Amino acid sequence: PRQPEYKCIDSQYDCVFYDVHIDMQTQDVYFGFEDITLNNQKIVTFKNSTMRKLPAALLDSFRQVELLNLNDLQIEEIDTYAFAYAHTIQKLYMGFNAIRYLPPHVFQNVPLLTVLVLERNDLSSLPRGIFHNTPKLTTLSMSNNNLERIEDDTFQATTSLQNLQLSSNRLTHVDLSLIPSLFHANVSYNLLSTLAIPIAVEELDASHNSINVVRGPVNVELTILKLQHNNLTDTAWLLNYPGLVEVDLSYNELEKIMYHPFVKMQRLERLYISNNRLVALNLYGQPIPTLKVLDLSHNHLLHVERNQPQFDRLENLYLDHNSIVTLKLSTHHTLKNLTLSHNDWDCNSLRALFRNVARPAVDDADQHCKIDYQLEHGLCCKESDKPYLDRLLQYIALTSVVEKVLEAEVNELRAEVQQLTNEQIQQEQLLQGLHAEIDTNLRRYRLPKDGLARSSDNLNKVFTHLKERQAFKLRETQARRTEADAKQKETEDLEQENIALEKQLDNKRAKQAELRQETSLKRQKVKQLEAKKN
Amino acid sequence: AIHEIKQNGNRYKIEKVTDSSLKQALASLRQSAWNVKELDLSGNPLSQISAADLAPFTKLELLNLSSNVLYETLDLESLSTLRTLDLNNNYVQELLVGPSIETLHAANNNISRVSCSRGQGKKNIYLANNKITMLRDLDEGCRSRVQYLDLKLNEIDTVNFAELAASSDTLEHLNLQYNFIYDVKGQVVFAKLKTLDLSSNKLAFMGPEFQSAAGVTWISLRNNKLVLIEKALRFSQNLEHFDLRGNGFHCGTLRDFFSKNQRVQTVAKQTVKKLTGQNEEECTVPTLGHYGAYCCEDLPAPFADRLIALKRKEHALLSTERLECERENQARQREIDALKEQYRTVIDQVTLRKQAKITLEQKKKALDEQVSNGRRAHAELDGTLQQAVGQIELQHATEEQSPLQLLRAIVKRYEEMYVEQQSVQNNAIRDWDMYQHKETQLAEENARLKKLNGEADLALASANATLQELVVREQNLASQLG
Ligand SMILES: *[C@@H]1O[C@H](CO)[C@@H](O[C@@H]2O[C@H](CO)[C@@H](O[C@@H]3O[C@H](CO[C@H]4O[C@H](CO)[C@@H](O)[C@H](O[C@H]5O[C@H](CO)[C@@H](O)[C@H](O)[C@@H]5O)[C@@H]4O)[C@@H](O)[C@H](O[C@H]4O[C@H](CO)[C@@H](O)[C@H](O)[C@@H]4O)[C@@H]3O)[C@H](O)[C@H]2NC(C)=O)[C@H](O)[C@H]1NC(C)=O
Ligand SMILES: *[C@@H]1O[C@H](CO)[C@@H](O[C@@H]2O[C@H](CO)[C@@H](O)[C@H](O)[C@H]2NC(C)=O)[C@H](O)[C@H]1NC(C)=O
Ligand SMILES: *[C@@H]1O[C@H](CO)[C@@H](O[C@@H]2O[C@H](CO)[C@@H](O)[C@H](O)[C@H]2NC(C)=O)[C@H](O)[C@H]1NC(C)=O
Ligand SMILES: *[C@@H]1O[C@H](CO)[C@@H](O[C@@H]2O[C@H](CO)[C@@H](O)[C@H](O)[C@H]2NC(C)=O)[C@H](O)[C@H]1NC(C)=O
Ligand SMILES: *[C@@H]1O[C@H](CO)[C@@H](O[C@@H]2O[C@H](CO)[C@@H](O)[C@H](O)[C@H]2NC(C)=O)[C@H](O)[C@H]1NC(C)=O
Ligand SMILES: *[C@@H]1O[C@H](CO)[C@@H](O)[C@H](O)[C@H]1NC(C)=O
Ligand SMILES: *[C@H]1O[C@H](CO)[C@@H](O)[C@H](O)[C@H]1NC(C)=O
Q1: How many CA atoms lie within 13 A of B444 on its CB side?
Q2: Residue B226 near residue B207, CB atoms below 8 Å
Q3: Coiled-coil segments, which residues (chain B) (predicted)?
Q4: Angle, vertex CA B276, rays to CA B270 and CA B279, nearest 5
Q5: For residue A69, with 0-12 CB atoms within 10 Å meaning exposed, 13-18 middle and 19 or more buried, which class applies?
Q6: CA nearest to A128, candidates A112, A149, A99, A144
Q7: CB-based contacts of B266: which residues, under 8 Å, 6+ apart?
Q8: Between vectors from CA A136 to CA A134 and to CA A138, what angle results, nearest 5°?
Q9: Ligand 5 residue neighbourhood (C-beta within 6 Å)
Q10: Which ligand is closest to the CA of A21, given by its number?
């Protein structure tokens, strides 16, 4: 018979199947001509189609496809043999569907595969040997799936894999150092806690994990390294990446920065360290001569002035949100961008500083000052002959509020007092391990701890923090979703308006044919009127 | 009457008296009131004292309540003739005395307020080993015309000399050793001050305010945490003892201060030699160098580094100095015990037990309060944890869960939820990117079709104009032809 039969429509692509709809009950389908050899279109896609299951019938009848675009076709299952005859596919696009699993030898016969996108599906794992036969694979994306592990053999035969996207899965293990060809990779928004870095990758984004350990061979090509939002607590590992140009260590757990891990960086320009727990910084012992942007904002820096020899050499220096008391710049400094607000300035230090830098180079400002402070050049400052002594006293005064916080009748009492002293010791022991953990959670979430407040108040500080954080994240996601829906709407309206522009093109062709008939009919009449005039 | 009232001239002593018998005891002296010039109640189990019961003795000039078990308020404001009051070794908490007090012995108490009605004489006040936390804990009168003021072993943080201005002309001895003082402040000329003892406190800067003690013979800042000395200080030739051992000085200030108090340098040497036997302090590290007699060091910025070290503890991700600290706290408890000895009185075994009964009743009572604060803190936590598990969804717990375990499960769950939420958001952002790329593909196709229409619009217009030129030739011929 050949009852349901779908045919190409040359337009970018040389084959576009239209209005195809397969579901889970659908039994038999036919693509192109019966004579498989007339089906030699190389660049195939679908329009207005939805294929719950990708039929074996498609590349059974089309064995000459180079680029197969199955993006966003509600695919949920791939037929165990849909790719048995797919020898020629170089580029396979299957993003944005609902594929839950790949059949184990689904790519055993596409050995010229160079590009594969499976982003935004429901993969939970990869079958052993899934890529053992695509040695030519150069770009692979599986961002937005639910993967938990990439086993170590996964990429043993793909010795050209250059661009790997795994962003936004649930990954707790993946060893990139086993894929030495990597050129670009993104494993951001996973659950990693160690990051192995392969020998020659040049841009790597592993932000939003829980990394605390970085490892892998010295790699001199690594240029951009994004690690913002992790669990980093030391930086010595940096010594191994002498070629960095930018590194982002923001939203980590660093407590100090020293120059030692940077001494081998021949071309570092951009170093981001906002939002750690920096209490000290020494980048002056050996300055980084090439650096241009250094972001230290939102930490606990107090004394940074000896860093003058590094700061003088920067273009962009963000000190905001700290407790910096003094800062010192040469008349010859090169800053074009400087942030200074929200610290604890000494007025003498601010006045001398604003002899050498002025707004608009200083990019921010304070609004209101505490009781003994007043604005100079737009920032709060207190007058003092010995600012550091002063800050040391201020601090101690806040903490000391907390640091101020029948003789048978005699034998029965000594007993009573011992039994009570024991109940009281036991009470502290019993709730000890708990008080430890409350303090660990206030440190973890950067909450400030009121050494006055009763214990259930600190415990509420953690819970109130978590609940607010959940709510704000949820509202934010709702917003993003509202935005996606709105943008899908727009594309649905656009396609409707394109159909109407096409119907108009259709009417105008009909009008052109009519007019062309009317023209010849007049050309005729006028020829007749001329003979009748000899 | 198991109690005995011994008389010797006009000094009376009462023994084996108790709280329930003392009022009787005193009544049996009303006959003789004119003659009660000193009254000595020491070494009994008394725990309260009725100022009013003693007001008949209008000639009473000395009252010795030493080594009883007095608690709470001791109020004798009303005894206007009273001149010497000894209550060493009790547990008094607030103390009020009258307009005649010349000498006030109150060591080894629990004192944290003292009032002294206004008066004309000097006062010698002895308060070693109490709980004074600031000079204003003593009322204005308590600080007027003080000649000798011993506040050793109290709990003061900061001294403000101005608060002792009403003793500019009288104050000769000020002991503040073994407190917790980290700032001193105020300029006042103490015309008579012979000695000032700030040993074992926590001072970091000997500043301008020490011109107030420029006149002293004897001064100690031993065992503080000093780093800088104000150079403008000018001490008198009167100075003979000048102890600064146990600090951490930056040589800069030793040199700057010796430079215009040259004298003081040999005074420093002579002091360490009197006290230790060699002419320089034994620095904690031998590598370390003196300037004159005191260990010192060219320090980059000692105050900043101390503040940074504090801010590190405050902000460290995880929750040495526990050896510096613990031996500093033993130093204090050795001084307290030592002192509890230097003021100890003789007491008979039957009144010791009579005393230990009242004292144990107070310990028991305080312990009940504490054990019950404990119980309350505990139920508050359990309550809070039960509100918390009612707001999320925990995994199933096979075993009974402690509060530690509950807090760990709760945070863990919020962390799962946050991650879930973030993953959802990522998908939404990726969807917006996919549809936006689709929009640009579609809007390309929108211009391709809009331009094709524009061009059909034109081509219809051409073919029309051409149909019209033919229409004109048809009507020109037909005119010509019929
Ligand atoms: C590794 O893998 C992850 C994928 O997970 C990649 O992470 C993505 O990175 C980019 C950053 O490069 C992120 O996109 C940026 O988003 C910011 C944030 O904008 C949001 O908030 C703004 C501030 O209030 C607001 O303006 C935004 O609203 C805009 O966008 C929405 C889209 O819905 C729209 O409603 C509006 O019309 C707005 O335009 C938004 O809510 C954004 O500010 C960036 O802006 C673009 O334009 C600026 C203009 O100056 C330009 O300079 C930028 O280059 C940029 O094009 C930018 O879009 C992205 O959100 C992350 N995606 C995910 C999925 O998390 C990561 O980049 C990969 N790493 C590497 C190294 O490649
Ligand atoms: C950040 O890194 C530290 C160090 O690896 C993690 O703390 C360890 O993890 C648990 C208990 O917290 C145990 O495996 C170790 O005993 C911990 N080590 C230390 C030194 O505390 C910590 O959990 C990581 N933080 C996060 C949020 O993952
Ligand atoms: C109050 O009475 C006590 C004794 O209860 C007197 O204390 C004597 O103090 C001296 C030192 O001053 C010691 O040598 C004696 O041993 C103490 N006597 C006893 C029995 O211990 C105390 O001096 C009296 N106070 C006043 C002000 O007179
Ligand atoms: C010394 O003083 C403190 C405080 O003045 C005493 O504790 C107070 O006493 C009452 C009764 O026990 C309580 O209501 C308060 O809770 C206490 N305040 C504080 C801060 O604890 C303490 O008992 C006294 N010491 C002795 C041994 O008498
Ligand atoms: C094709 O061309 C002619 C000429 O412009 C159109 O005929 C009319 O032209 C006259 C003269 O200016 C006007 O009075 C009319 O407005 C025009 N319209 C009508 C209805 O006759 C003719 O209509 C054109 N055909 C089309 C639709 O393009
Ligand atoms: C896709 O096919 C269905 C069924 O004929 C149709 O109703 C829907 O709008 C189609 N989309 C387009 C743009 O043809
Ligand atoms: C640099 O600072 C901000 C952003 O970092 C920018 O607004 C500002 O105008 C730039 N600097 C100058 C000189 O204006």
Answers
A1: 6
A2: no
A3: 322-373, 435-462
A4: 45
A5: buried
A6: A149
A7: none
A8: 110
A9: B 464, 468
A10: 6
The type of residue at A165 is Q
Question: Residue A115 — φ and ψ, nearest 5°?
Answer: -130, 130
Q: Which residues contact A387 (CB under 8 A, 6 or more apart)?
A: A325, A326, A346, A348, A349
Domains in chain B: boundaries? 1-299, 300-399, 400-482
Q: How many residues does chain A have?
A: 534
The whole-angstrom separation of Cα A218 and Cα A299 is 30
Disruptive mutation site among A119, A417, A438 for chain B (greatest number of B CBs within 10 Å): A417
A5-6 and A30-31 strand pairing: parallel
Counting every residue, how long is chain B?
482
* Interacting residues of B157 by C-beta distance below 8 A, sequence separation 6+: A397, A400, A404, B133, B134, B179, B180, B181, B182, B183
CATH assignment of B1-299, given 3.40.50.300, 3.30.1660.10, 3.20.20.140, 3.80.10.10?
3.80.10.10
Half-sphere exposure of B249 (CA within 13 A, CB side): 27
In A287-339, where does DSSP find H-type helix? 308-311
Pairing of strands B84-86, B103-105: parallel
Contact assessment for residue A177 and residue A217, using Cβ atoms and an 8 Å cutoff: yes
Residue B242 has a CB neighbour count (10 Å cut-off) of: 25
With contacts defined as CB-CB under 8 Å, which chain B residues touch A487? Answer: 432, 435-436, 439
- The residue contributing the CA closest to ligand 4 atom 16 is B369
Residues from chain B contacting residue A95 (CB–CB below 8 Å):
434
Interchain pair A388, B408: CB under 8 A: no
Q: Are A505 and B357 an interchain contact pair (Cβ–Cβ within 8 Å)?
A: no
Rg of chain A over all Cα atoms, to the nearest angstrom: 35
How many helical (H) and strand (E) elements, i.e. helices and strands, does chain A have? 7, 28
Peptide bond into B286 cis (omega under 30): no
The CATH class given to the B400-482 domain equals mainly alpha
Tokens coding A192: 């990693």
Contacts with B374 from chain A: Cβ below 8 Å: 424, 427-428
- The preferred substitution site among A231, A233, A253, A277 for testing ligand 2, maximizing ligand atoms within 8 Å of CB, is A231
- Secondary structure (3-state) at B259: coil
Residue nearest atom 1 in ligand 3 by C-alpha distance: B64
CA distance B427 to B434: 10
Domain at B300-399, CATH from 6.10.280.140, 3.40.50.720, 3.40.50.300, 3.30.10.20: 6.10.280.140
**CA distance to partner chain B, nearest, from residue A343 (Å):** 14
Closest CA to A456 of B384, B374, B401: B384
Cβ-proximal residues to B158 (8 Å cutoff; 6+ apart), any chain = A397, B134, B181, B182, B183, B184, B185
Angle at Cα A291 formed by Cα A288 and Cα A297, nearest 5°?
105
Q: At what angle do helices A455-531 and A432-444 cross, to 10 degrees?
A: 30
Picking from A431, A147, A436, the residue whose alpha carbon sits closest to that of residue B377 is A431
A191, A518, A529 member nearest B477 (Cβ): A529
The two tokens of residue A147 are 């993967």
Tally of CB atoms within 10 A around B312? 16
**Beta strand pairing call for A224-226 and A246-248:** parallel
Residues of A in Cβ contact (< 8 Å) with B304? 302-303, 325, 388, 392
Residue B295: DSSP 8-state: E
Whether residue A519 has its Cβ less than 6 Å from ligand 6: no
